[PDB]
């Protein structure tokens, strides 16, 4: 209702944000570390089969 | 009309006057009370968020 009230609920939301931020950035990190293991796997077999 | 009369005229003029004196005291004192309560509110909320 009053200013004072928008501008707590405007920050508590900043604070939602950048923890969103934080989290965007991890689950990013995850995705491409599990990608990265697969496809390190995946080369590895592919170059004891084609090579031999 | 006559002399007494404005008299007593003046003396109530007087009266509302002091009246006035006293309202604006409380008018005062009610705004930087309030002032005072949003004031501290709002340090309370910086000082928390600050110096997390």
Do not use: P
Request: proline share 0%.
């Amino acid at each position: 209702m009053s200013l004072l009230e928008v501008i707590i609920v405007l920050g508590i939301i900043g604070t939602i944000a950048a923890g969103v931020v934080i989290l965007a950035q991890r689950a990013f990190d995850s995705r491409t570390v599990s990608e990265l293991v697969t496809n390190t796997n995946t080369i590895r077999v592919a170059m004891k089969d084609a090579y031999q």
